[PDB]
Structures are given as C-alpha cells and as structure tokens.
CSV table of C-alpha atoms and ligand atoms in Angstrom, one decimal:
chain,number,residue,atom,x,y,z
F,1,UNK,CA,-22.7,-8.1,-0.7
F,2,UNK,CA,-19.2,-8.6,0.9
F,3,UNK,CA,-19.5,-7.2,4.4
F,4,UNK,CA,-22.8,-6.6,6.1
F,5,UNK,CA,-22.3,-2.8,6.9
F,6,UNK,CA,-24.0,0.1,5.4
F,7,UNK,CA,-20.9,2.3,4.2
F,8,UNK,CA,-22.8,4.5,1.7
F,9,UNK,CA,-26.1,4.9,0.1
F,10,UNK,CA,-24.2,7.7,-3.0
F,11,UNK,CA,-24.6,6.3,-6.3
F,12,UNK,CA,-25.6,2.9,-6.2
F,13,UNK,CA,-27.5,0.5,-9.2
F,14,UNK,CA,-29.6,-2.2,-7.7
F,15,UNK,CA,-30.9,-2.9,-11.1
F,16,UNK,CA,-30.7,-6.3,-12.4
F,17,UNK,CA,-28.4,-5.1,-15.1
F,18,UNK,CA,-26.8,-7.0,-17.6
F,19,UNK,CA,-23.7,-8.6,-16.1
F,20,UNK,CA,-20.3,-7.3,-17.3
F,21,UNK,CA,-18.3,-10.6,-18.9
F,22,UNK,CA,-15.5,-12.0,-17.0
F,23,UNK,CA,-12.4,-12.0,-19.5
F,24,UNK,CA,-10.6,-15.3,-20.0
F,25,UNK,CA,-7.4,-15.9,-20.6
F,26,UNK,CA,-5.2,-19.6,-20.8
F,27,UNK,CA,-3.0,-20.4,-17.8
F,28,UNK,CA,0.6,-21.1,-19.6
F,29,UNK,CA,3.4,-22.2,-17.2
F,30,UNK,CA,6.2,-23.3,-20.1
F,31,UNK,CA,7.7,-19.9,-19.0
F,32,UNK,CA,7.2,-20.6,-15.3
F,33,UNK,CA,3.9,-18.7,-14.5
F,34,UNK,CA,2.6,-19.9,-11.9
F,35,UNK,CA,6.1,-21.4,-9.8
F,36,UNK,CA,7.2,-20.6,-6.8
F,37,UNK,CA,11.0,-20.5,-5.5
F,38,UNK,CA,11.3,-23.9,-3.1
F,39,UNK,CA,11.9,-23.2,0.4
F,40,UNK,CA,15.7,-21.7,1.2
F,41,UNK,CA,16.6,-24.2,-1.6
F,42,UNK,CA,18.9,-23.6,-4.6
F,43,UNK,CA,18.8,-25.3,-7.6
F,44,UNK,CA,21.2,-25.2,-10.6
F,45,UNK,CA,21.2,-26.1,-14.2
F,46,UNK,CA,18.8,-28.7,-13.4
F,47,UNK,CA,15.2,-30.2,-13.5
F,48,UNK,CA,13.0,-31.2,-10.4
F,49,UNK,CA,9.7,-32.6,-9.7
F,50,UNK,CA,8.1,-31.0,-7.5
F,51,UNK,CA,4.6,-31.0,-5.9
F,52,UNK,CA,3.2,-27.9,-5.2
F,53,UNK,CA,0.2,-25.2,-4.8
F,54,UNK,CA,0.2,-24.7,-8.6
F,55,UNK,CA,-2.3,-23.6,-10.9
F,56,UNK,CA,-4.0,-26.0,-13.7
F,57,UNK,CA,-2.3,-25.6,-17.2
F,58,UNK,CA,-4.4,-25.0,-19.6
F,59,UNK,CA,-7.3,-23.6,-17.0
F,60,UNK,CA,-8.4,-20.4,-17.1
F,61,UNK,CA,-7.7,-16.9,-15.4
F,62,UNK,CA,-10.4,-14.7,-14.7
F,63,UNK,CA,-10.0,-11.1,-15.0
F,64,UNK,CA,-11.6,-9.8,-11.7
F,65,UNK,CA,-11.2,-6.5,-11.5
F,66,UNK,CA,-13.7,-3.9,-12.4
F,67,UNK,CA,-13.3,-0.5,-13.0
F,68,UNK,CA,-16.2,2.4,-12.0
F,69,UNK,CA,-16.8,5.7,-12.2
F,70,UNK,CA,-19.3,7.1,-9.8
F,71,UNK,CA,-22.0,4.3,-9.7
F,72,UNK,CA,-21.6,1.0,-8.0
F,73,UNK,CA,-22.8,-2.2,-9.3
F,74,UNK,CA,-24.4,-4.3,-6.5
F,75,UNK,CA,-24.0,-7.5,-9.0
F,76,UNK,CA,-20.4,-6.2,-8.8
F,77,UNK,CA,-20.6,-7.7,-5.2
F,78,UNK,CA,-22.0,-11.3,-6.1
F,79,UNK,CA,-20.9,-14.9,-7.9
F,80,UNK,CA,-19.4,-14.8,-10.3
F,81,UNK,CA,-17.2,-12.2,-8.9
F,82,UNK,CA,-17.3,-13.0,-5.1
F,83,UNK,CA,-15.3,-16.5,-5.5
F,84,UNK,CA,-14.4,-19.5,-3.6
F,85,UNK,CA,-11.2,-19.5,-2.3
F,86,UNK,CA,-10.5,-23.4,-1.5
F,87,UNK,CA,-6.9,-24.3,-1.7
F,88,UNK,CA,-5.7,-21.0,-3.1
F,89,UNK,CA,-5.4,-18.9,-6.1
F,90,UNK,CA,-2.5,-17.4,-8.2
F,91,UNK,CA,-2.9,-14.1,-9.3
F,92,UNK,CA,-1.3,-12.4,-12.3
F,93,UNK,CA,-1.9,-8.1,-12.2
F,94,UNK,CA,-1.0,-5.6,-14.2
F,95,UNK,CA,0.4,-2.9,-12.7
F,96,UNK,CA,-1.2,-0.1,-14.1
F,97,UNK,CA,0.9,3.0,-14.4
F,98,UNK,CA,-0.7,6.3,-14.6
F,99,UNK,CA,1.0,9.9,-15.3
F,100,UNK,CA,0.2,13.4,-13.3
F,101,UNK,CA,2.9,16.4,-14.4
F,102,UNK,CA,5.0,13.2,-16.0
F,103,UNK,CA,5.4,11.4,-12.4
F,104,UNK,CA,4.1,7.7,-12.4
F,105,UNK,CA,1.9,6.8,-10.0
F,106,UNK,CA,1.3,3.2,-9.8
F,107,UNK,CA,-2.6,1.4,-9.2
F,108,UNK,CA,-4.0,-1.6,-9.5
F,109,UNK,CA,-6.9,-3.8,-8.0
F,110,UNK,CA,-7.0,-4.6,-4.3
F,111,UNK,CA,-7.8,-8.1,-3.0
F,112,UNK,CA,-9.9,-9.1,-0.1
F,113,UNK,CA,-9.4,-12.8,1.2
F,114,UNK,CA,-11.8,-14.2,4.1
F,115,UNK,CA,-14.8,-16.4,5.0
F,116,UNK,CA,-18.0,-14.2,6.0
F,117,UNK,CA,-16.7,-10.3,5.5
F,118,UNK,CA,-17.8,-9.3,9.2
F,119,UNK,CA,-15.8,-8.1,12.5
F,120,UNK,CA,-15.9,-11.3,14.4
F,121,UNK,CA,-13.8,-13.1,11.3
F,122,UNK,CA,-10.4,-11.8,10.1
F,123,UNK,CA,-10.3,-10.1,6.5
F,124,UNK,CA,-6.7,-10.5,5.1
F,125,UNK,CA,-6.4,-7.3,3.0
F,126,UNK,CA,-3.8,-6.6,0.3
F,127,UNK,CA,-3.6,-3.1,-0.9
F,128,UNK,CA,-1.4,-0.9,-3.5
F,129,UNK,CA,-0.4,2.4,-2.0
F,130,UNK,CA,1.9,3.4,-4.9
F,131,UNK,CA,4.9,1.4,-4.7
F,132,UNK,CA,3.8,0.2,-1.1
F,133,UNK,CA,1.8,-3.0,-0.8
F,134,UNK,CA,0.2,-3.0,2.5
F,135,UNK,CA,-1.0,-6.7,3.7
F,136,UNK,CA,-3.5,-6.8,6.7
F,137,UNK,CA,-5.2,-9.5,8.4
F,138,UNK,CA,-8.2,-7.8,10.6
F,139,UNK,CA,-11.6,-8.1,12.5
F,140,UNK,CA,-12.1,-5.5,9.5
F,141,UNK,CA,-16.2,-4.3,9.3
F,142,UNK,CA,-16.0,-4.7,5.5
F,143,UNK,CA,-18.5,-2.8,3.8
F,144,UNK,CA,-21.4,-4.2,1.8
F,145,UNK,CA,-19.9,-2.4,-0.9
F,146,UNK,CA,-16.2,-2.1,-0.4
F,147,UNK,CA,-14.1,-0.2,-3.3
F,148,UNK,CA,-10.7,1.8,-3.4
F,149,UNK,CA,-9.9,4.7,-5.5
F,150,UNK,CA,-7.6,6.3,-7.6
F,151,UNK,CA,-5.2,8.5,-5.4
F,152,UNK,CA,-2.9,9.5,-8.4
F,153,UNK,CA,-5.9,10.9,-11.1
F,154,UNK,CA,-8.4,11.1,-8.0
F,155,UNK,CA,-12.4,9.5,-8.1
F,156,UNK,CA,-15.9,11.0,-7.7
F,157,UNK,CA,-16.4,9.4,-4.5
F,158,UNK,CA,-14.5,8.1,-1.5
F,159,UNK,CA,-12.4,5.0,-0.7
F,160,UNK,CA,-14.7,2.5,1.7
F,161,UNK,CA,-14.1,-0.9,2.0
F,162,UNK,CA,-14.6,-1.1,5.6
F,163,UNK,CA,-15.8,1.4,8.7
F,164,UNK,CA,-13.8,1.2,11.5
F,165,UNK,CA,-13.6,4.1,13.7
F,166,UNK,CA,-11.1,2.6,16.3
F,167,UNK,CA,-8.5,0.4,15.2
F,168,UNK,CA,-9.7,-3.0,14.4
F,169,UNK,CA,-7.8,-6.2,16.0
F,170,UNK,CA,-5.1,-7.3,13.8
F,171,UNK,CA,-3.0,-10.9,13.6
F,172,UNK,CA,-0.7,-9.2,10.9
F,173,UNK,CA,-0.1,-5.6,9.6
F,174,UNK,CA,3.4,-5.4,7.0
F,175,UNK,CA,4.4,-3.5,4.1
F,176,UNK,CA,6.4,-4.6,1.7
F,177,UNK,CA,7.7,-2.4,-1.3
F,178,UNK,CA,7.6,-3.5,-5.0
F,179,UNK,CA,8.7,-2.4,-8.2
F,180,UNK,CA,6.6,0.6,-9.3
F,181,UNK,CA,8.1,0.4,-13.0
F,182,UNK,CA,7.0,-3.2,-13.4
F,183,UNK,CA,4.4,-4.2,-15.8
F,184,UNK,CA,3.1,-6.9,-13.8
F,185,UNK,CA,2.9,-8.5,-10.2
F,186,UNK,CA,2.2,-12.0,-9.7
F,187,UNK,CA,1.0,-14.0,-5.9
F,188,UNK,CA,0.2,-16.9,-4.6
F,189,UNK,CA,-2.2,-16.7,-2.0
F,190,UNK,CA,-2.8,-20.5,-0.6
F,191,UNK,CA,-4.3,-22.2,2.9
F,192,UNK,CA,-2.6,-25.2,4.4
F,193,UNK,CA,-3.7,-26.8,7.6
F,194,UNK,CA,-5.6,-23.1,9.6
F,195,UNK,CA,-2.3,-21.5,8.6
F,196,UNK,CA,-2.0,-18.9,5.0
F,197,UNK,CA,0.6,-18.5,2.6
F,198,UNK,CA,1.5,-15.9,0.8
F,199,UNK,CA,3.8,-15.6,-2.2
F,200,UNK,CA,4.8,-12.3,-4.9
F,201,UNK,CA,6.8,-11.4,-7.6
F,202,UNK,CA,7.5,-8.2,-9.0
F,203,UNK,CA,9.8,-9.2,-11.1
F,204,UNK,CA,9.9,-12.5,-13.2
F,205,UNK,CA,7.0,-14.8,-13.0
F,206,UNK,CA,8.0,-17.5,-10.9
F,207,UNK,CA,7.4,-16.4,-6.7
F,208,UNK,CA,8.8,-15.9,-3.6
F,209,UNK,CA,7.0,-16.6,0.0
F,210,UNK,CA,6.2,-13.1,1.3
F,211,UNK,CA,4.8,-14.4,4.7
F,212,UNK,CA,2.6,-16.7,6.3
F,213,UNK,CA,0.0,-16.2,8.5
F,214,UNK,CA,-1.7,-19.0,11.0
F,215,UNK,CA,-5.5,-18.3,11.2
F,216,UNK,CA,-6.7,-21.6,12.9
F,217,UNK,CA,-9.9,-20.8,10.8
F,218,UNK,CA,-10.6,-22.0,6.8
F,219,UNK,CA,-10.8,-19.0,4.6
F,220,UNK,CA,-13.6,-20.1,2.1
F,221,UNK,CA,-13.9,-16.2,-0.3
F,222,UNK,CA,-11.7,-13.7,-2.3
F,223,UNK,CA,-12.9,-10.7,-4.0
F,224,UNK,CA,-11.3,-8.1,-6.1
F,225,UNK,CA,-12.5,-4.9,-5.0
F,226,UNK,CA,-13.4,-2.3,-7.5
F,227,UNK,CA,-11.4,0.3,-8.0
F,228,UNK,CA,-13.1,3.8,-8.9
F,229,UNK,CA,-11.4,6.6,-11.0
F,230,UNK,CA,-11.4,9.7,-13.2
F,231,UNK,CA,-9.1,8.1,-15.9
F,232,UNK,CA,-8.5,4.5,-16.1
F,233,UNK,CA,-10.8,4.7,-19.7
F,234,UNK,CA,-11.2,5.1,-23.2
F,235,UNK,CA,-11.7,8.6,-23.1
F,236,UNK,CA,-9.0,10.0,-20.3
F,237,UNK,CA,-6.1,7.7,-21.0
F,238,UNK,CA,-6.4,3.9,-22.6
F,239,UNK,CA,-5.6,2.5,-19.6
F,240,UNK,CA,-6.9,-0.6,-17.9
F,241,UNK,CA,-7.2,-2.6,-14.5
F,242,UNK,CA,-6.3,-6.2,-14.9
F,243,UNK,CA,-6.1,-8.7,-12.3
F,244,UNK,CA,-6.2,-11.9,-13.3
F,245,UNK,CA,-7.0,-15.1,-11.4
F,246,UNK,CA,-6.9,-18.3,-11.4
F,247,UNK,CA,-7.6,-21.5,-8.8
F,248,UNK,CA,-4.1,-23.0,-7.0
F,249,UNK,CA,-4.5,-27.2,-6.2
F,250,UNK,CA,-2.0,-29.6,-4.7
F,251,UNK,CA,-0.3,-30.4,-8.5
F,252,UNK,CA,3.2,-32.1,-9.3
F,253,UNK,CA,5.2,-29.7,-11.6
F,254,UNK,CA,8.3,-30.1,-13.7
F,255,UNK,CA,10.7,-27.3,-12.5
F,256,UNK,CA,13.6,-26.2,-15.2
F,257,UNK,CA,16.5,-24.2,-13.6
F,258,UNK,CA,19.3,-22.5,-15.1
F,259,UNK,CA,22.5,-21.5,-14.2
F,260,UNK,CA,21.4,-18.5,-11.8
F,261,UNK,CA,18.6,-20.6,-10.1
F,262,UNK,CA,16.4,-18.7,-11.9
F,263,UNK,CA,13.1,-21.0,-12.7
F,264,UNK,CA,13.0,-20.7,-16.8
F,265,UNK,CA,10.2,-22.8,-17.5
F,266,UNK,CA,7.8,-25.3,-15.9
F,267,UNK,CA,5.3,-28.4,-16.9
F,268,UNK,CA,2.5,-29.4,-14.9
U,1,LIG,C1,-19.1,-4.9,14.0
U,1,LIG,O1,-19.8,-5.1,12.8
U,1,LIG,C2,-21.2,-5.0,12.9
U,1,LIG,C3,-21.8,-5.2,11.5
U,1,LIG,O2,-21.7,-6.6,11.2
U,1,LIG,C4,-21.5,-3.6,13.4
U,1,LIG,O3,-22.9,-3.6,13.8
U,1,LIG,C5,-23.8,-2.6,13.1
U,1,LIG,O4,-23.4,-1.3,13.6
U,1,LIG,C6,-24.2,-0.2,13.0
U,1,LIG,C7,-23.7,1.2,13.6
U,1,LIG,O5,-23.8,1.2,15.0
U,1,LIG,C8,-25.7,-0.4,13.3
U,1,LIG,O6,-26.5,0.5,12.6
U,1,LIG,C9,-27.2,1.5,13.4
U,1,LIG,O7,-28.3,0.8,14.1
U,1,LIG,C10,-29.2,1.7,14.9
U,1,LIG,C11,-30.3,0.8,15.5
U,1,LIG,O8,-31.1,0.2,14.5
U,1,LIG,C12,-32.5,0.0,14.9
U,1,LIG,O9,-33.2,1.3,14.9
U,1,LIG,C13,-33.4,1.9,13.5
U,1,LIG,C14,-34.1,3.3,13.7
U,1,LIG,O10,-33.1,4.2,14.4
U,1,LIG,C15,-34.2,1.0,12.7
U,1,LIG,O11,-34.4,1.5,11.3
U,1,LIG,C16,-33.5,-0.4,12.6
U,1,LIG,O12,-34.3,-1.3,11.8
U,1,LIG,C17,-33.2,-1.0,13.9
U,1,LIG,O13,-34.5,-1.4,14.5
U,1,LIG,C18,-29.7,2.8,14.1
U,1,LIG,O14,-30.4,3.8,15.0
U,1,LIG,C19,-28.6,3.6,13.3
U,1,LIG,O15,-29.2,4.6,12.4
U,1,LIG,C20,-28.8,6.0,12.8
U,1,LIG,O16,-27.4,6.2,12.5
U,1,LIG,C21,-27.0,6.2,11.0
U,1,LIG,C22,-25.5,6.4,10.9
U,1,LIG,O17,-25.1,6.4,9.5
U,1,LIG,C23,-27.9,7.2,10.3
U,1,LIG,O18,-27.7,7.0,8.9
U,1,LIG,C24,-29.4,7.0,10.6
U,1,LIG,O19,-30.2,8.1,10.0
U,1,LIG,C25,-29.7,7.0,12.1
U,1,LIG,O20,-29.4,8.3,12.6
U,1,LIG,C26,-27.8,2.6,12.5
U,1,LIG,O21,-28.6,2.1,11.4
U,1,LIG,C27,-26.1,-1.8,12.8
U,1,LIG,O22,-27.5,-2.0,13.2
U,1,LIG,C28,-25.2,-2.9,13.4
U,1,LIG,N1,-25.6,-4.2,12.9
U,1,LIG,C29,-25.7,-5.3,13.7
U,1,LIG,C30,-26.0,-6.6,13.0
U,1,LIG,O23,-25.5,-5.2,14.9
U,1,LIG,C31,-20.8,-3.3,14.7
U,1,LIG,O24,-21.0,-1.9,15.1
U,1,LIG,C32,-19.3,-3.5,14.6
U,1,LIG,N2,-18.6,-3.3,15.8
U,1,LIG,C33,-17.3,-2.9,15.9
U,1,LIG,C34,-16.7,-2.8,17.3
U,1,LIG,O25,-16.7,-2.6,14.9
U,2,LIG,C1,2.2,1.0,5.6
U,2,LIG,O1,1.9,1.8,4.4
U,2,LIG,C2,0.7,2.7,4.6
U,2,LIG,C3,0.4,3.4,3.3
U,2,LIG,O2,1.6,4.3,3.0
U,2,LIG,C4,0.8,3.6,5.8
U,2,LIG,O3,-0.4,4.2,6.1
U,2,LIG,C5,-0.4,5.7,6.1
U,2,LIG,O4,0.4,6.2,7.2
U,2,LIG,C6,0.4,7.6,7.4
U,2,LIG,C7,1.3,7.9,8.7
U,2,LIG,O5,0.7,7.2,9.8
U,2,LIG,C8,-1.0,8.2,7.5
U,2,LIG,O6,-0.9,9.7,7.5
U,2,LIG,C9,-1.8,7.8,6.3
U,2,LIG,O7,-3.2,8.3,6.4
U,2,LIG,C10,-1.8,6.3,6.2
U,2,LIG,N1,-2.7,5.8,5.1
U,2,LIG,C11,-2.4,6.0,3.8
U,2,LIG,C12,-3.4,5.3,2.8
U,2,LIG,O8,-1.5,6.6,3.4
U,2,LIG,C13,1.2,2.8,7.1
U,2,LIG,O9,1.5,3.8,8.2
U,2,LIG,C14,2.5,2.0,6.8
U,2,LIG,N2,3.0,1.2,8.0
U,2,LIG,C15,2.4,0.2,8.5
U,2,LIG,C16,3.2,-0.5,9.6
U,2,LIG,O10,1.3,-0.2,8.2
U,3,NAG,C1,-28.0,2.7,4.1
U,3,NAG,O1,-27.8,3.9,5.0
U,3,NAG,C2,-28.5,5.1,4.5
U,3,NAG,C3,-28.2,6.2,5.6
U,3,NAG,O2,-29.0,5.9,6.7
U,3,NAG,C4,-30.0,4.9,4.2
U,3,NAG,O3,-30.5,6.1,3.5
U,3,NAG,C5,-30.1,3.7,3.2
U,3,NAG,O4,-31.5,3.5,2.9
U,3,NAG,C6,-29.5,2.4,3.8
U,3,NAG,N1,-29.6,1.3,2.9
U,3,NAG,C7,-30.0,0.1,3.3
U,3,NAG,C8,-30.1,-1.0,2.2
U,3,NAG,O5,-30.3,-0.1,4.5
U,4,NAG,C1,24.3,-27.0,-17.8
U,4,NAG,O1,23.9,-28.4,-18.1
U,4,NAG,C2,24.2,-28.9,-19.4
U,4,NAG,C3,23.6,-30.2,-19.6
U,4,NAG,O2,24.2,-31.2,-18.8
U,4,NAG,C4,25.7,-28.8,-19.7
U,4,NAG,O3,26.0,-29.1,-21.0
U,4,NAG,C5,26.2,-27.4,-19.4
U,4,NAG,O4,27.7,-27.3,-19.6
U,4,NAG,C6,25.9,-26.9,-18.0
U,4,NAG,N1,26.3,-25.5,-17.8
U,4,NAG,C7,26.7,-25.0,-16.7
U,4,NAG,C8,27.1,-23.5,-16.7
U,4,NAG,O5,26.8,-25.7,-15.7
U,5,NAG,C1,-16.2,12.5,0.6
U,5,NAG,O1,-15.7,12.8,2.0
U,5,NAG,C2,-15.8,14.2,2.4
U,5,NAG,C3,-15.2,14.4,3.8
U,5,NAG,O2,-15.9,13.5,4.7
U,5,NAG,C4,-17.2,14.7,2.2
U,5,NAG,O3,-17.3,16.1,2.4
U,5,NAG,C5,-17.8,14.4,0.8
U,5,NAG,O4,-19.2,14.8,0.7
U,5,NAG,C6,-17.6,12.9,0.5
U,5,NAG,N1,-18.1,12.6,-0.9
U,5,NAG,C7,-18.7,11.5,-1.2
U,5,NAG,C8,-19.3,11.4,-2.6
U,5,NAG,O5,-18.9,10.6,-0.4
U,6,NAG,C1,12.0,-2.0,-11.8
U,6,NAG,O1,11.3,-2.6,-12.9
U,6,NAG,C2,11.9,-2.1,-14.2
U,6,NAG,C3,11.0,-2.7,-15.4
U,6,NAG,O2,10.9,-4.1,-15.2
U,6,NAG,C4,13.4,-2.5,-14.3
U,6,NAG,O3,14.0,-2.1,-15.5
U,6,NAG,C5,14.1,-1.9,-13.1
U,6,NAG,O4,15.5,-2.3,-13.2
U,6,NAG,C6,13.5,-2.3,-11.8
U,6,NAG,N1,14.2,-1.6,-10.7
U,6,NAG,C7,14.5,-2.1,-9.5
U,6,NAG,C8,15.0,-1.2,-8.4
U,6,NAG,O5,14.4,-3.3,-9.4
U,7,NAG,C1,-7.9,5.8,-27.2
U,7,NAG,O1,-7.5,5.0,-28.3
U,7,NAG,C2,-8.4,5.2,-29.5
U,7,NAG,C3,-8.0,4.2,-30.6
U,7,NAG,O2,-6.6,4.4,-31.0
U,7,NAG,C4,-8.4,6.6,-29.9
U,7,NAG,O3,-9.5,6.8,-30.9
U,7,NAG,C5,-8.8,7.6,-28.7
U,7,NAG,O4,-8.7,8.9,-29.2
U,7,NAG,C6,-7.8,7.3,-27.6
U,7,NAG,N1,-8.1,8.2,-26.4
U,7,NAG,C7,-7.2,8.9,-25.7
U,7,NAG,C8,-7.8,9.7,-24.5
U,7,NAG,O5,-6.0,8.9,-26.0
C-alpha cells in the first residue's frame, strides 16, 4: 500500500499475479542527461568539474509508470515499485500527447515523494494538469491505492490518490507551466540536510532548480502513481506512459559548455 486509507473497494486484483517487468533502459549523460544548470552561474565555452546530485552513468532507469484500465493491481502498490528515495532521483518522462477533435491534451505519470504516506507526514505531490504542473507538499491522507486519470480521453473510474474533505495543511502549493508540445520532461528531485530540492526541464536535458522546500524531516519513498485511461493502448491509440527513473548520489561530473551556456555534454 502507499497511504493507509480505504479510498475504494471498485475493481481491485489482490491476486498474486504475475508481476509486470520494470523496463530498463542505460543512463547516458555524454549529451548532458542528467546535469543541472549551477547556481546563478554562467559558464562559457568551457569545461568544469563539478560535484553534484548526479545520476550513475552507465546505471539504470526504471520505467515506473503503469498504465490501467479499470482494475488495480495491489502489487502495483509494493517493491519493486514503491522505491527508496535516499539522496534523490532523476527522472526522465515522456510527455505523452493525446488528441480529442485534433486538440492536444498533454498526460503523463504523477509522482508521490514521502516517508510513511499518512496525514501526520507531508506527501510532496507533483501532478500534470495539461500544461500545468502542480507541486504540493501536504499532510495529504494518501490512499492505499492512489491513481490519476486521464482527463483528455476520460477513465472508467475516478481520480483518488488521497481523501481529504477539508483542505489539508500545506508547507508549499505552486504551479509552474511547461511546454505542452515537448516530447519529454526531465527533474531532479534530491534531499540535502531536512531541506528538498527540486529541479525541471522542459526543454533540453540538462535542469534548472524549480524550488526548494525545507522539511526538517528525511523523505525515505517515491512512487509513480498509476495512471488509468480509455486510450493510452494498443488498441485506441499506440500511445504509452513512460516515466523513467533513476537513483541521484553526491558524484563529480565533467560539465562541457558552449558558447550560449548551454550544457552540451557531461562525463561522470
Ligand atoms: C488522517 O488519516 C487517517 C488514516 O491514517 C484517518 O483515519 C481513518 O479515518 C477513517 C474515516 O473516518 C476511519 O474509518 C472509519 O472507521 C469507523 C470506526 O471503525 C470501527 O468500527 C467499524 C464498524 O463501524 C469496524 O468495522 C472497525 O473495525 C472499527 O472497529 C467506521 O465506522 C467507518 O465505517 C463507516 O463509514 C464508511 C465510509 O466509507 C462506510 O464504508 C462503512 O460502511 C461505515 O458506514 C470507517 O471505516 C479509519 O478507521 C481511520 N483510521 C485510523 C487509523 O484512525 C483520519 O480520518 C485522517 N484525519 C484527517 C483530519 O484527515
Ligand atoms: C494550480 O493548478 C490547478 C489545476 O489547474 C488548479 O486547481 C483547479 O482550480 C480550479 C479553480 O479553483 C478548480 O475549479 C479545479 O477543480 C481545480 N482542480 C483541477 C484538477 O482543475 C489550482 O487552482 C491552481 N492554483 C494553485 C495556486 O494551486
Ligand atoms: C474498504 O471499504 C469498503 C467500504 O466500506 C469495504 O467494502 C471494503 O471491504 C474495505 N476494504 C478493506 C481492505 O478494508
Ligand atoms: C571557444 O573555445 C575554443 C577553444 O579554445 C576556441 O577555438 C573558440 O574560438 C571559442 N569560441 C568562442 C565563440 O569563444
Ligand atoms: C465516480 O464519481 C461519481 C460522482 O461521485 C459517482 O456517481 C460514480 O459512481 C463514481 N464511479 C466510480 C467507478 O467510482
Ligand atoms: C514547445 O516545444 C516545442 C517542441 O520542442 C518547440 O518547438 C516550441 O518552440 C516550444 N514552445 C515554447 C513556447 O517554448
Ligand atoms: C497499433 O499499431 C499496430 C502495429 O502497427 C497496428 O496493427 C494497430 O492497428 C495499431 N492500432 C491503432 C489503434 O492504431
């Protein structure tokens, strides 16, 4: 489970299914993936070492997100899914773009970030509204079985990731827009001393802070919520959720700039 609160009882498999497999893919930085914009610092035509929260080269992403239908997989809401968050973790997520009457709507996976999932802990929530990326931190009542939905294409059932009748207590509520037409959004999301850190790109690879966030608490979990839909398949559309991850660690990085600033390519 994530949370502790019973949200719904519709369509749900306790069965000790088969597992779906994770997807792996190999965290390349030569491109900078994975890099962050230092500070208010410029850099020129130049190359910099730099220590960092960086991912490994040459780990692996995991491809966390799941796509449903109606029925809920309670292993969806268990290791190897539910992961440690320790220092951090970079994320690299498609954006995936859907068409009703030839408008783009744009979905992809929400991200839950925490320690224990109930309303005496503060859930930090990052969630795609369609060109609006909402960022909460909250005493959030997470469901056991939290999930969005398609709002574009629509879903048999209703979003839940948390109940909260009145309005939780919050240390942070912001939006921030990105890039609907983008084909890929990338974050850091690190911990340093009770206080979080948050980076994004839209565009490009390499990131720039968003916010950060003191807890005075160690976040210890992340999960990708599942997203449920109509379309998002084979058979509607040959689309597909991805939102890769992959750990963050305290790693010295070669940093190429060229002659915008712009980070071009990177060696751990
Ligand atoms: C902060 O987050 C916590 C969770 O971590 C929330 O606490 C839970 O809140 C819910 C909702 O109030 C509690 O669930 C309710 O408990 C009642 C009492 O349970 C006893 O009695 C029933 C029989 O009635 C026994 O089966 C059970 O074993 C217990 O002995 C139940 O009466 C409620 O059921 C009724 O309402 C539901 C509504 O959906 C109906 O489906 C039922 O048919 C029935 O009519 C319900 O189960 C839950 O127990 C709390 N958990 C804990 C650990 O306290 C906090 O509410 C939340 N606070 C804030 C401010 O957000
Ligand atoms: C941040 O963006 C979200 C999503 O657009 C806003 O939440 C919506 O706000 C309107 C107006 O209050 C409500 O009718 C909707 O029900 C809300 N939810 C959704 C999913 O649309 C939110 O108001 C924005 N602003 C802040 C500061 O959070
Ligand atoms: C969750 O709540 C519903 C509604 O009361 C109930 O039918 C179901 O059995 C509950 N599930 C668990 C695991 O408590
Ligand atoms: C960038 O650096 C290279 C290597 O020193 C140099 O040859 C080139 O002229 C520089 N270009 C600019 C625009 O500064
Ligand atoms: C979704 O929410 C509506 C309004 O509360 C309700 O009528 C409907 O039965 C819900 N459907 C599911 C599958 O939860
Ligand atoms: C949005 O992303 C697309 C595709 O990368 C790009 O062509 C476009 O210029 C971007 N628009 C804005 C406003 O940045
Ligand atoms: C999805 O792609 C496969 C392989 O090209 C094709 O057979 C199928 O008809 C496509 N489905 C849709 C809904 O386009």
């Amino acid at each position: 489970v994530i949370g502790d609160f019973n949200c719904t009882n519709f369509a749900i498999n306790d069965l000790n299914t088969t597992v779906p497999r994770i997807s792996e893919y190999v965290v390349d930085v030569s491109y900078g993936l994975g890099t962050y914009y230092i500070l208010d610092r410029v850099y020129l035509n130049t190359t910099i070492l730099f220590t960092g929260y960086f991912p490994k080269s040459g780990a692996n992403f995991r491809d966390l997100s799941l796509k449903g239908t109606t029925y809920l997989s309670t292993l969806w809401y268990q290791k190897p899914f539910l992961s440690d968050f320790n220092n951090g973790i970079f994320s690299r997520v498609k954006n995936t773009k859907l068409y009703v009457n030839k408008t783009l709507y744009s979905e992809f996976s929400t991200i839950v970030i925490g320690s224990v999932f109930i309303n005496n802990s503060y859930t930090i929530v990052v969630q795609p509204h369609n060109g609006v990326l909402e960022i909460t931190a909250c005493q959030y009542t997470m469901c056991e079985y939290p999930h969005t939905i398609c709002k574009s294409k629509g879903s048999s059932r209703n979003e839940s990731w948390h109940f909260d009748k009145s309005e939780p207590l919050c240390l942070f509520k912001k939006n921030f827009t990105y890039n609907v037409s983008t084909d890929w959004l990338y974050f850091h999301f690190y911990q340093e001393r009770g206080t979080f850190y948050a980076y994004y790109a839209d565009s490009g690879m390499p990131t720039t802070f968003l916010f950060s966030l003191y807890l005075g608490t160690l976040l210890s979990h992340y999960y990708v919520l599942p997203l449920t839909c109509n379309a998002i398949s084979s058979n509607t559309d040959n689309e597909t959720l991805q939102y890769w991850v992959t750990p963050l660690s305290k790693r010295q990085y070669l940093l190429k700039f060229d002659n915008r600033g712009v980070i071009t390519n990177a060696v751990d």
